Amino acid sequence: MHLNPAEKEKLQIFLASELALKRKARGLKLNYPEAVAIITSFIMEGARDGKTVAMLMEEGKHVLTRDDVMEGVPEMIDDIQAEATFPDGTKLVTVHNPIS
Amino acid sequence: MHLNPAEKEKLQIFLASELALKRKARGLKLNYPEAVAIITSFIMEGARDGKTVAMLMEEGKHVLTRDDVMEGVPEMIDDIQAEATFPDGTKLVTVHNPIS
Amino acid sequence: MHLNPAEKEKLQIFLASELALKRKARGLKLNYPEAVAIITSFIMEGARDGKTVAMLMEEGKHVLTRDDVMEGVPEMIDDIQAEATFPDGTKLVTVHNPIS
Amino acid sequence: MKINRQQYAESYGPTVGDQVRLADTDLWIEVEKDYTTYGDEANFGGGKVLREGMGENGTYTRTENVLDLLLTNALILDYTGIYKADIGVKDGYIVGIGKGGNPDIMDGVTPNMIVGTATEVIAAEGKIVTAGGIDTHVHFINPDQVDVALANGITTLFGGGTGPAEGSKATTVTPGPWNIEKMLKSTEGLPINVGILGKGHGSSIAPIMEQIDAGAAGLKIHEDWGATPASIDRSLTVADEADVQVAIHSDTLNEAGFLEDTLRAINGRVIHSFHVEGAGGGHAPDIMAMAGHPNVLPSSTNPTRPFTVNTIDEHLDMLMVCHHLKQNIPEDVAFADSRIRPETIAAEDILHDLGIISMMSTDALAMGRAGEMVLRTWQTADKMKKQRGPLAEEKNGSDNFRAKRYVSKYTINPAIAQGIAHEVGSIEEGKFADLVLWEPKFFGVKADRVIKGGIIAYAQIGDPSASIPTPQPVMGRRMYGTVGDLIHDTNITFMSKSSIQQGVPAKLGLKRRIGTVKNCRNIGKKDMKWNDVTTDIDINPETYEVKVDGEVLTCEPVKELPMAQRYFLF
Amino acid sequence: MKINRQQYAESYGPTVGDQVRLADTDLWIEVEKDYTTYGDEANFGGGKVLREGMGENGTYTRTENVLDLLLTNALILDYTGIYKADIGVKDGYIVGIGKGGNPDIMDGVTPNMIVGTATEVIAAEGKIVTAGGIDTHVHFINPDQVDVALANGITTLFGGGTGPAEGSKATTVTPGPWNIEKMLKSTEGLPINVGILGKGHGSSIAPIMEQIDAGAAGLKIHEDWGATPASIDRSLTVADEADVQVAIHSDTLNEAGFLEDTLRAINGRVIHSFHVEGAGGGHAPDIMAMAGHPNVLPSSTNPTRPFTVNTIDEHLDMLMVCHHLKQNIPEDVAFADSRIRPETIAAEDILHDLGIISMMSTDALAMGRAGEMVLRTWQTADKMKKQRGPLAEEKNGSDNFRAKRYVSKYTINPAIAQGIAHEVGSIEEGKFADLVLWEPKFFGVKADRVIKGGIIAYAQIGDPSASIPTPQPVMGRRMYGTVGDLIHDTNITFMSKSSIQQGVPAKLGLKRRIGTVKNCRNIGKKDMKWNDVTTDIDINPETYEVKVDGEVLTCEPVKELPMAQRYFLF
Amino acid sequence: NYIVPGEYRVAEGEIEINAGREKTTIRVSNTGDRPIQVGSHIHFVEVNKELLFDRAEGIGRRLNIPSGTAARFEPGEEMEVELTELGGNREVFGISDLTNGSVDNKELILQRAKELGYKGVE
Ligand code: NI
Ligand code: NI
Ligand code: NI
Ligand code: NI
Ligand SMILES: [O-]
Ligand SMILES: [O-]
């Protein structure tokens, strides 16, 4: 596979997102690390799909809403940042105030 | 996400449980680490759901039965222990003789 | 669970295979590490199922075809090798030219 | 007051006449004797015996017959016996095997096994305790291989390599003074005992000998460097002068000679014949005949151990891929068919059972599995019991004779072969405290705790954030014996007498304990414990049939092994 | 007997006139010459040439022209040429480039490249071998950054920082004697070469100079500490006395001056201009005009490399978030718009292609990617070939001229700029054996093996529990060169002459090899290999249009790059 | 324009090995009952005793085959091989200890070969 350090770490984010999505599916309001994991994995999968940085800056604000998460979680998350390989190489995505 | 050491390790248990559940779904009798993983992940998800320690001590004895696992596996597993964050903080769950 | 070093590492391969299978399911042509992960996990799960080394040497050539992967990926993968616990202990599987 | 035997064994571990199943095999070990005094067993905990004024002596300073560590109620499995005892450790060494506690109030206390203020306790009740495994066929290719070895109860790695360089990927060789110095320095960070082999190749003495003076513990002759009559001869001349062992991987190709030519070059001198069955290398097809000779210390590597239904398919393909051979080139297919032989692999199972092959080893990362030497030893013994029956020598329906024959193959015999059995390889008074605790349900599969120089180096233990150490995930982890400067005191670098006399440790700044290699050139097959058989092994050059005492040695491959899918997640 | 060229290249790697594609780019390198003697190629393995009495000499001791390590059949890509040779290493240094083996029986053996008893072998047939990358813009923020760098073939980190302190998160600065001493001690555990920059700020000499005497290898002038005329002047006075390099991140804000003011303060003295395009920092909007001057050694950082369709959206947002700027504050938007400019980023691609920007670097963890300096160098060269065509200087349809121009940007030119090219930065006899092996399919993406001081430090290698090292998972792992005390011998701490003369290594107990920084103040643009162009760069203050020789330099951003989604799991 | 990452585009032509050196063809027989494989760079007179050939014609020579390849003789197989000349100093040390110096010492090499039972010394 030739995994580099980042590829090994970022597998963890996908895994945490899968865990969080199972928790959301059985009706739980998600907590801070769950919410971050879901939005982060969404960004990385969007890059893999060939979306633009601008598309993901927009979409990342609509992945989870206030009623998906515990009290205070929207106000705990100011930004979520991820780097992923786009068709044009690694780029940084910052999603500001992802959950209003 | 702000993962601490335990959060990183315990992602592994969820992953091993997902692997084991796929093996059980395609008809395999489960082995020692598979069985432990499934029951452990069940306990940790139950804490996340807001069950009590007492509920999980009971439920953990009914997750897998003798006919789900290989010969000798029930007698290899005396106890399964897990710590997870309950609504009232971290608690220890011990499931005694989980598989009769 | 009593995980040894290899059991911990090989959980990563299963995880990368799950990620890659999700990418294939939403219509992406798979890349080099994705393709390797899928075929590797297939071999390890086949051992767990109790297939022979000879069965997996055959089957591993039919898991992904040229139209499942990006241009050049078939020619990048000369061999995929995995060791797994068969009913008769650890064995090495080499799948030559898995994707024609 | 009397205790029934079931309750006694549950509380203190088994006693005389009790049997224990090894993992999920059909091998049973029986307690031969017990050093305890019934009623004065040592144990540690709340309201237990090892407390001040009771089973712990409150008078004596550490120097006064007091232990640093007592392992209570151990079931020892060793070439010396299968028996119940307390094990006392002091200054990193086993100082007492017998009965620990307090002579103030207890009968039968071994006089230098006082539990005092200075004493740590490990509860071994219900555990099997063995010597650490001695792996003498290690390729140093990937440092991640050390934890793999520790998890299966290996405590000494003898071999060579500089990491994933082609010479090292093929051969157990650290070549020349500079590579040897570099790898002695690397060894300062490896939490296991180590000895380094130099290149056993040359036609002049000085290029070979300078490796011994630089700090090598032995030599490896390998066909990939030219296993010629000259290289064999010079290496053994060096070894006889330096008192180190020579390992050989002979000329598979028969290019400069057949087996008889290699034996003539050896000229009756002591040699360790690696992977003697020959799938791992050697004169095609008859190398395994080496194991009949009195001057040969013969080892197997582990992927042929034991003979299973996947072995041949796996090995033929592995050999073709490794050697870049083509299925459509007849010379390539002929070579592979000459080297991977069911006839010699089946016979290798039986030669182990008969005590004709004396040792196991891995061939870690070159053609063998760093964490499966102990595993496959017991799978072989289990298969042989199933196919050949209890050995004639057994009694009481126990497998003790087989268990001593097989434990010897990866503990004492490699240590004797290497000239290191004064330090390691068995649970005996005066030897280094390299000890492995096993739960019987995991015996030979996953070690519970690996003690190195009297401190735990590796353990199966759980969540480091938990209230107690048993919650999930339970996995193999490095313990305090591997941390900071304690890695120096808990591990031995084995070196030649000449490198030690010439001050190589001081020159390189080595802080590890330094072990001397010695008494390697005087020994033979007769010195291999429980595995001392010499005989004429005939290998038919047409059929590859192996005969001993006029009988063909053959057995079937098995479809299933114990110590396999019940235990492993992959 | 004759071998067809396809079979020859498959067995020994390519020879004269053969071409190799770099990864999945459209760049082709051609073998210019070959040091071999056809028929006497070196190779290692069963029945291969490097065996005793054959291609391995059995006579000579290590001192007698024998190598510690031979890399066989390497395709070298270096500023000095693109050619086929064996590489011989001894005492951690490259001692021979030519033909290795045994003068007993082989023609054309380079006299100090004898394969003897002491020699390890690395097979480089079918590999591209380069010098280790020299990254001169490193923020020491997170120790996990070292493996990231090694995985992409970087072997030297020059920069500053104390970990994730704000000063370090912004600036390549280890400030003052105490922080410098602490980070020299930290460096004892980092498996890569290191040089530390002090704070290039002050109005008195002594506060700046004491950092050089404490063990700094250079200085960094950064606007966040005040890139004032005084700080620039004092730093260059110190550098000229101490013979170390100064890196500058100039006054973006133009607060105390415009570019002409910074150049006046420099006063013709030698300086390394970091991220010279200016997105990473510098006089808005015209900093990149620095790259035209003869006393400027100009580098790019990597996130602008090359100009892609996501670059501007990514950089404008990154700058706003990092600087806590608000989209609704017009001064904040004006600042961002003045600093992130498609006109100068597009021109930066072309200035690299023309040899006007001499160096690449990361800006690791401050505004740049620790593991993408090599990656993005080749993506830039590939884009320029697609958009500008083969350079005029090319011949035979090869991209050799471009390949030497671009490899120079991350190997020899940073080493020359830093005063360390006597030790590192190229594959030349007498230099430290920092070598990177690449499979051509992974060239510039994922290194196969990273050699540090003649021992493998990092490798893409598989399951440590397997019979062989290739089974999955194959991932980047630290090798024996990083373990125990060998980390000291395989890595260099680069230090000022004065700190070395004053005994700082002994005072701090540094065990690493100590490298001397020297010959930094005599050099200029003319000394940058293949990248020596001086010219008047005009940047229009209204339109940000870049002109050289009266021509606007512009190119389009690309939607796709090679060395991207075919390779990476994320 | 299909891209195979890292592919070669080899030049036209062929590579002549051991160019300019004398070539010699000889018949060689494996008189033993086990296979013998002989590498490209072993001094040919020093191969396995049970290979029968004119030992004098192996002195100062090796197989004229690509570097790193080998010729295989099955039990009882006789076949022709082509030899080329050793180069460099034309000295051989070690291997079977038949030479230990110049390959010009034919008399001495053959005397040692004959005394040790290397087949085919006239
Ligand atoms: Ni071998
Ligand atoms: Ni080996
Ligand atoms: Ni900057
Ligand atoms: Ni910076
Ligand atoms: O081996
Ligand atoms: O920067």
Short mmCIF file of N, CA and C and ligand atoms in Angstrom, two decimals, chain E residues 137 139 170 220 222 249 274-275 280 301 363 366-367, ligand 6:
data_model
loop_
_atom_site.label_atom_id
_atom_site.label_comp_id
_atom_site.label_asym_id
_atom_site.label_seq_id
_atom_site.Cartn_x
_atom_site.Cartn_y
_atom_site.Cartn_z
N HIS E 137 13.65 25.33 5.23
CA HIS E 137 12.57 26.14 5.84
C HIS E 137 11.68 25.28 6.72
N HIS E 139 9.89 24.54 10.39
CA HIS E 139 9.44 24.94 11.73
C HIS E 139 9.42 23.68 12.59
N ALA E 170 4.99 30.48 14.04
CA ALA E 170 5.08 31.54 13.00
C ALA E 170 6.44 31.57 12.31
N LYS E 220 17.34 33.57 11.29
CA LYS E 220 16.12 33.89 10.57
C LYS E 220 15.65 35.28 10.97
N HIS E 222 12.45 37.50 10.54
CA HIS E 222 11.00 37.34 10.29
C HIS E 222 10.26 38.61 10.67
N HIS E 249 12.29 36.58 5.89
CA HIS E 249 10.85 36.80 5.65
C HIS E 249 10.64 38.28 5.92
N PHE E 274 13.48 33.53 1.70
CA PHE E 274 12.47 32.46 1.87
C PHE E 274 11.19 32.85 1.11
N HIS E 275 10.38 31.83 0.76
CA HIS E 275 9.09 31.95 0.05
C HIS E 275 9.10 33.23 -0.81
N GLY E 280 3.84 33.20 1.23
CA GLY E 280 4.32 32.77 2.55
C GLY E 280 4.88 33.92 3.37
N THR E 301 8.61 28.23 -0.87
CA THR E 301 7.96 27.19 -0.04
C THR E 301 6.94 26.45 -0.89
N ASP E 363 8.38 25.03 4.50
CA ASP E 363 7.64 25.84 5.49
C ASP E 363 6.83 24.91 6.39
N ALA E 366 3.97 25.63 9.29
CA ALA E 366 3.71 27.09 9.47
C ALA E 366 2.92 27.59 8.27
N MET E 367 3.34 27.22 7.06
CA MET E 367 2.53 27.43 5.83
C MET E 367 3.12 26.55 4.73
O O G 6 7.12 31.23 6.61
#
